[PDB]
Amino acid sequence: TFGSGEADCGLRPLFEKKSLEDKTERELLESYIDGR
């Protein structure tokens, strides 16, 4: 791929890479549909 270099951004090594869910996280996902 292109972009501007290395594609590893946005991946917390302490959460995403370890398949973990931080408390608040779940709330953001529910906001993408729920409401309407």
Binding site: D8, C9, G10, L14, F15, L28, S31, Y32, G35
Partner: protein, 257 residues
């Protein structure tokens, strides 16, 4: 952050603290967008009315912190700035429009479990996510209350604060302040009748308003804590700089010169 909560160790690896050399004090927050490029708000480096106008040699960058005050020895990294690029259309005069700035670290920061760059949104991840109702996360070591009381409590926080705010519909943003809005900005915060509350506050400026794309689980930075009226006021909403728009500039100056 007013109405927030202590963050989890490593839940926001791009949250950077813009630190002042002498006197020692917290200036603003920022976000690591690469191994040497940090993104912050312009007014944290330049804003005449308060006499703010800094130089690369008078600031410090503390990356990977958690405790607001403690020197986190083996965990944090403290770099010096090489050059500060402010947007040539920073309207601190009347609009606080294009309130954005980039700083280049003298040396690249080695990434770790506590330090990792946030992703800048693309023309479509932006479009799909930046929509009224979608919630974002704002972090920072700023004030806990607009004006805090001492003794039976304090005001400044101890450990990084996190809070989730819903992007608000344009028209309401406009109808909430006397300060003319622009396309380069967007507002977030709960509406009065919604019940839930929270908002960034002084010392949180320059902080990232990030969201998580369901498409790849990546953390994108949609906005930057810019300005607002008070802190957690019923009726006002915080205004964050529209990163996705100014992106054209950021990418340009990332090729530098």
């Amino acid at each position: 952050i007013v109405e927030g909560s202590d963050a989890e160790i490593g839940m926001s690896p791009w949250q950077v603290m813009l630190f002042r050399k002498s006197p020692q004090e917290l200036l603003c927050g920022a976000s690591l967008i690469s191994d040497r490029w940090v993104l912050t708000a312009a007014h944290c480096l330049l804003y005449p009315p308060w006499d703010k106008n800094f130089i690369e040699n008078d600031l410090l960058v503390r990356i990977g912190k958690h405790s607001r005050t403690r020197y986190e020895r083996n965990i944090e990294k403290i770099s010096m700035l090489e050059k500060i690029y402010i947007h040539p259309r920073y309207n601190w005069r009347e609009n606080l429009d294009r309130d954005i700035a980039l700083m280049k670290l003298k040396k690249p920061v080695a990434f770790s479990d506590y330090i990792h760059p946030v992703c800048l949104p693309d023309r479509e991840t932006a479009a799909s996510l930046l929509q009224a109702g979608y919630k974002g996360r704002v972090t920072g070591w700023g004030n806990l209350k607009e004006t805090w009381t001492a003794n039976v409590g304090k005001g400044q926080p101890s450990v990084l604060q996190v809070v989730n705010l819903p992007i608000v519909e344009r028209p309401v943003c406009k109808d909430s302040t006397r300060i003319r809005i622009t396309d380069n900005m967007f507002c977030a915060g709960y509406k009065p009748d919604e019940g839930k509350r929270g908002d960034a506050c002084e010392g949180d400026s320059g902080g990232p308003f990030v969201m998580k794309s369901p498409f790849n689980n990546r953390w994108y930075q949609m906005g930057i804590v810019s300005w607002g009226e008070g802190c957690d006021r019923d009726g006002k909403y915080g205004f964050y700089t529209h990163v996705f728009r100014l992106k054209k500039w950021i990418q340009k100056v990332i090729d530098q010169f």
